[PDB]
Design a protein around this ligand. Structure first.
Ligand code: DVR
Ligand code: NA
Length: 363
C-alpha cells in the first residue's frame, strides 16, 4: 500500500540517475497504480528551444508500434475477416512462389515464417518491388520452427490483415483502435497543428526525427506511431484490463494479442506483445533484452492451441528509432504498469532494469 508520495519518490530516484548516466535529454513516465495513471515528466523535449517535457509531448514509439498492429490484427480476427490459421497466400494471391506453402498468417505475425529478414530492403520502393522481394525470398528454416524478430514479417502481417476491411493500415488503425479507445493524440502522421508538441530526438548530440519510407502497403507502419504519455498510459490500461473496453471485437483483439502462441526459452510470443510468467527475476528480463539474444534466430515450442492471456504475466515491449527510446511493461495480476518515453535511444537493458525497479516497489 505505497502512497502516491512514496511512488513519486521511487520514480524520481530511479529516473533521475538514469537520465544522467545515459545522457537522456527528457523523459515522460506514467505509472498505472490503483486504477489510474500517475504522471512524471523530466527534462527537455527540445534542447535548443529550451522546451520542457510535458504530458502533451509527442515521442516516437518505434517498435512498440507493433503492439498496436497486433491488437488491430486481433480485432480483424474477432470480426471474422481473417484467421491466424489461413495461409498468407489467401490474402495475397499474387504471391505464387511455392516456398510460401505452409506459411500462415500466424507465422508472419509472430516471426516464425522461416527467416524473413529484420528489415525490408531499401531497394523495395513500391508494391511491385515488394512482391518481388517476397517472391525471391528463400527461407532458411521450415515454418513454425524458428523465431527471428523481423519487421519484414509482422509488417506484412499488418498490411494483409487490414485488406478485408478495405481500409489502408493508417485508416483501419484510427477507426478501429485509436478512436474507440479515445487515443486522440496518437498519430502515424503528426498533423501540422500538433507539431508544436512533437519532441526532437537526439543521437550523438544531433537533433533528429523519424523519416517517411517509400509509398507502399507498409509505409504507414514503417513510419511508426507517435503519441504522448497520457494516451500511452491509457493504451496500457486498455491492454491491462480489456474487460473495461466496450467494443466486443476490440476487447477480443486485445486478448488475442496477449495470448501465448510460442515459447522461446523463458519468454512467450504474442501478437506484438511479449510475455514472461510472473513472478520473474530482474536478471531474466534484463538479460533477455540484450540485442545478442533479442535479434538471434531461436527455436520455438508451439503452444497449440494458443494459450489465452495469463494474468500472472510480465507483459512488455521495447522500441526505439534513431533519436528515441521507449519501454512499456505491466502485470495484469497486480494491475500495475509503467510507460517510459525518452528522446534518446539508450540501452534496452537499462530501460528494463529501471522499469522493474519501480514496479517491484508496487508489488
Ligand atoms: C523497433 O524499435 C525496431 C525495428 C527495427 C528494425 C531494424 C533495426 C532496428 N529495430 C528496431 N529498434 C531497435 C534498436 O534500434 O535499438 C531494436 C534493438 C534490438 C535490441 N533488443 O537491442 C529492436 S526493438 O527493441 O524491437
Ligand atoms: Na537486398
Amino acid at each position: 500500500p505505497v502512497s502516491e508520495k512514496q511512488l513519486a519518490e521511487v520514480v524520481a530516484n530511479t529516473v533521475t540517475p538514469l537520465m544522467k548516466a545515459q545522457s537522456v535529454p527528457g523523459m515522460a513516465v506514467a505509472v498505472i497504480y490503483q486504477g489510474k495513471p500517475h504522471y512524471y515528466t523530466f527534462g527537455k523535449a527540445d534542447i535548443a528551444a529550451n522546451k520542457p517535457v510535458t504530458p502533451q509531448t509527442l515521442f516516437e514509439l518505434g517498435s512498440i508500434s507493433k503492439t498496436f498492429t497486433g491488437v488491430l490484427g486481433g480485432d480483424a480476427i474477432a470480426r471474422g475477416e481473417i484467421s491466424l490459421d489461413d495461409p498468407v497466400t489467401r490474402y495475397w494471391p499474387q504471391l505464387t512462389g511455392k516456398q510460401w506453402q505452409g506459411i500462415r498468417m500466424l507465422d508472419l505475425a509472430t516471426y516464425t515464417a522461416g527467416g524473413l529478414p529484420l528489415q525490408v530492403p531499401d531497394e523495395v520502393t513500391d508494391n511491385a518491388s515488394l512482391l518481388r522481394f517476397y517472391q525471391n525470398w528463400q527461407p532458411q528454416w521450415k515454418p513454425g520452427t524458428t523465431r527471428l524478430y523481423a519487421n519484414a514479417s509482422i509488417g506484412l502481417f499488418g498490411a494483409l490483415a487490414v485488406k478485408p476491411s478495405g481500409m489502408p493500415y493508417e485508416q483501419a488503425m484510427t477507426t478501429r483502435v485509436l478512436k474507440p479507445l479515445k487515443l486522440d493524440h496518437t498519430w502515424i502522421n503528426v498533423p501540422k497543428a500538433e507539431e508544436a508538441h512533437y519532441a526532437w530526438g537526439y543521437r550523438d548530440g544531433k537533433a533528429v526525427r523519424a523519416v517517411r519510407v517509400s509509398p507502399g502497403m507498409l509505409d504507414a507502419q514503417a513510419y511508426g506511431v507517435k503519441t504522448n504519455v497520457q494516451d500511452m498510459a491509457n493504451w496500457v490500461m486498455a491492454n491491462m484490463a480489456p474487460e473495461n473496453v466496450a467494443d466486443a471485437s476490440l476487447k477480443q483483439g486485445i486478448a488475442l494479442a496477449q495470448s501465448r502462441y510460442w515459447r522461446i526459452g523463458s519468454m512467450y510470443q504474442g501478437l506484438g506483445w511479449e510475455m514472461l510468467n510472473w513472478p520473474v527475476e530482474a536478471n531474466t528480463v534484463v538479460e533477455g533484452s540484450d540485442s545478442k539474444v533479442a535479434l538471434a534466430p531461436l527455436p520455438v515450442a508451439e503452444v497449440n492451441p494458443p494459450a489465452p492471456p495469463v494474468k500472472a504475466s510480465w507483459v512488455h515491449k521495447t522500441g526505439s528509432t534513431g533519436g528515441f527510446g521507449s519501454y512499456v511493461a505491466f502485470i495484469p495480476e497486480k494491475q500495475i504498469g509503467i510507460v517510459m518515453l525518452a528522446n534518446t535511444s539508450y540501452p534496452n537493458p537499462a530501460r528494463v532494469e529501471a522499469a522493474y525497479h519501480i514496479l517491484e516497489a508496487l508489488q
